[PDB]
């Protein structure tokens, strides 16, 4: 069993009050059932696309999800991910600076 | 230079319960989608035909369809004779080299562990492979029916195939997409210290420079990060600079790339 590595990234240079896309990179993880959820504030995010699942050369497991967001001040935003992995859910935050 | 990639993933949870899937890639490209509860491949991009007829992408997907079939019964019924739950992966395809010339490959994992290779005629567990594996690659190498179709496959269908999309894809492969970049910071582990981010995004093809620089001198604290995708067929990347608060002041980030006609992107902290 393989430990999925999680990276939060937005698709363009983020702007408060302005509409963008959130990502959410899941790596390095087998077996390849998997939960993944974008949090608004803690909250469930419901809209979130996921690209279909795909494997790597080392045959790790790799997905991609996203969804619409508009950055501002004082919203946080996370990806959580579940699996038989980790015996706890795993969250990563947006921190636009790092 | 391209690498043609088919990947099936198989989960086998119990005798009642199992899914295939498959996805196909045309270097980073992706080409095709084969969901267990789809009949039929999927194509993910207008060339995805390549340059077959409807007759020879039919004959060619019939097969599929009854490997797809075959594969799960075969693995159903070896599990009976010899537990779950069982992933089963399998990486298949071509490399193209310039002038004309191209390798296959067909190789396959259990639980996550490459174990057996198709190589010339026919099927190898590979050296360490767990020796319950040979009886069946055994059996499965009498099948010769099986043996000639995969030779096919690999020898002429595979760098065909991959040819006539190469051809029907040329804008969409040779497309340049444009990065933007912007700048960040957060505070550093130890005092005084601070962690600048030169972000990257929206570019196309893959090859890309990024340094932190100080006027003609690079920076060679520059820490790139992995190529990130994103959902729309471009690449993110970004490269962070371990700085002394106080030592910020005439730093720079310089992106290089193909898009931009030779006219690099540099922003200043
Ligand atoms: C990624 C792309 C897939 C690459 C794959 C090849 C696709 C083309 C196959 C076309 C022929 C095929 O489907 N054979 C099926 C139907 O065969 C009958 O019908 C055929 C035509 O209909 C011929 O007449 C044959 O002579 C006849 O026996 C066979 O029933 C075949 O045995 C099923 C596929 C077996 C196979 O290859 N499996 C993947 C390799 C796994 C090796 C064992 C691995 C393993 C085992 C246990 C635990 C962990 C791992
Ligand atoms: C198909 O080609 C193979 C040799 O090609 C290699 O193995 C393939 C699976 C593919 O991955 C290639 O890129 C590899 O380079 C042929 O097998 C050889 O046949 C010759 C001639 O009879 C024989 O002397 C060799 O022993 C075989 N080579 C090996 C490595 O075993 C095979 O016969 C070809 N089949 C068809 C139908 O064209
Ligand atoms: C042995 C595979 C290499 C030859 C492939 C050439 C034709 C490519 C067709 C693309 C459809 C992908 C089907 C995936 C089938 C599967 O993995 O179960
Ligand atoms: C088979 O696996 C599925 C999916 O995990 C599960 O819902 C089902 O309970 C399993 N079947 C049996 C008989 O245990
Ligand atoms: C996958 O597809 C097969 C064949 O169509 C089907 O019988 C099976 O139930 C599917 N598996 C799941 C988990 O949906």
């Given at each position: 069993?393989?430990?999925?590595?999680?990276?939060?990234?937005?698709?363009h240079?983020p702007?408060?009050?302005?509409?963008?896309?959130?990502?959410?990179y899941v790596?390095?993880?087998?077996?390849?059932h998997?939960?993944?959820?974008?949090?608004?504030?803690?909250?469930?995010?419901?809209?979130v696309?996921?690209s279909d699942?795909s494997?790597?050369?080392?045959?790790s497991?790799?997905?991609?999800?996203?969804?619409?967001?508009?950055?501002?001040?004082?919203?946080?935003?996370?990806?959580?991910?579940?699996?038989?992995?980790?015996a706890?859910?795993?969250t990563?935050?947006?921190?636009?600076?790092? | 230079?391209?690498?043609?990639?088919?990947?099936?993933?198989?989960?086998?949870?119990?005798?009642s319960?199992?899914?295939?899937?498959?996805?196909?890639?045309?270097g980073?490209?992706?080409?095709?989608?084969?969901s267990?509860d789809?009949?039929?491949?999927?194509?993910?991009?207008?060339?995805?035909?390549?340059?077959?007829?409807?007759?020879?992408?039919?004959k060619?997907?019939?097969?599929?369809?009854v490997?797809?079939?075959?594969?799960?019964?075969?693995?159903?019924?070896?599990?009976?004779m010899?537990?779950?739950?069982?992933?089963?992966?399998?990486?298949?395809?071509?490399?193209?080299?310039?002038?004309?010339?191209?390798?296959?490959?067909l190789?396959?994992?259990f639980?996550?562990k490459?174990?057996?290779?198709?190589?010339g005629?026919?099927?190898?567990?590979?050296?360490?492979?767990?020796?319950?594996?040979?009886?069946?690659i055994?059996?499965?190498?009498?099948?010769?029916?099986?043996?000639?179709?995969?030779?096919?496959?690999?020898?002429?269908?595979?760098?065909?195939?991959?040819?006539?999309?190469?051809?029907?894809?040329?804008?969409?492969?040779?497309?340049?997409?444009?990065?933007?970049?912007?700048?960040?910071?957060?505070?550093?582990?130890?005092?005084?210290?601070?962690?600048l981010?030169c972000?990257?995004?929206?570019?196309?093809?893959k090859?890309?420079?990024?340094?932190?620089?100080?006027?003609?001198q690079?920076?060679?604290?520059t820490?790139?990060?992995?190529?990130?995708?994103?959902?729309?067929?471009?690449?993110?990347?970004?490269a962070?600079?371990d700085?002394?608060?106080?030592?910020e002041?005439?730093?720079?980030?310089?992106?290089?790339?193909?898009?931009?006609?030779?006219?690099?992107?540099?922003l200043?902290?």
């Amino acid at each position: 069993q393989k430990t999925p590595q999680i990276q939060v990234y937005s698709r363009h240079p983020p702007e408060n009050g302005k509409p963008n896309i959130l990502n959410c990179y899941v790596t390095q993880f087998h077996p390849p059932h998997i939960e993944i959820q974008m949090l608004k504030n803690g909250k469930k995010i419901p809209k979130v696309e996921m690209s279909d699942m795909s494997f790597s050369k080392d045959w790790s497991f790799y997905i991609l999800a996203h969804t619409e967001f508009t950055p501002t001040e004082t919203d946080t935003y996370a990806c959580r991910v579940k699996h038989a992995s980790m015996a706890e859910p795993k969250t990563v935050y947006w921190d636009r600076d790092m | 230079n391209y690498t043609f990639r088919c990947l099936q993933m198989s989960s086998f949870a119990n005798r009642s319960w199992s899914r295939t899937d498959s996805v196909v890639w045309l270097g980073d490209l992706q080409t095709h989608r084969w969901s267990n509860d789809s009949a039929t491949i999927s194509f993910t991009k207008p060339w995805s035909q390549g340059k077959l007829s409807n007759q020879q992408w039919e004959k060619l997907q019939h097969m599929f369809q009854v490997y797809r079939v075959s594969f799960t019964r075969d693995i159903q019924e070896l599990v009976k004779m010899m537990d779950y739950p069982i992933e089963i992966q399998l990486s298949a395809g071509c490399e193209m080299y310039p002038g004309n010339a191209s390798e296959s490959f067909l190789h396959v994992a259990f639980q996550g562990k490459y174990v057996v290779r198709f190589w010339g005629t026919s099927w190898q567990t590979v050296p360490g492979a767990p020796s319950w594996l040979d009886l069946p690659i055994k059996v499965l190498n009498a099948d010769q029916g099986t043996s000639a179709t995969v030779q096919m496959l690999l020898n002429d269908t595979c760098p065909l195939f991959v040819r006539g999309l190469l051809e029907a894809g040329k804008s969409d492969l040779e497309k340049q997409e444009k990065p933007v970049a912007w700048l960040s910071s957060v505070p550093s582990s130890a005092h005084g210290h601070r962690q600048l981010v030169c972000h990257v995004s929206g570019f196309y093809p893959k090859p890309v420079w990024v340094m932190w620089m100080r006027g003609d001198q690079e920076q060679q604290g520059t820490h790139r990060g992995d190529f990130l995708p994103n959902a729309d067929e471009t690449w993110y990347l970004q490269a962070t600079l371990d700085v002394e608060a106080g030592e910020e002041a005439g730093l720079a980030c310089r992106v290089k790339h193909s898009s931009l006609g030779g006219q690099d992107i540099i922003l200043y902290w």
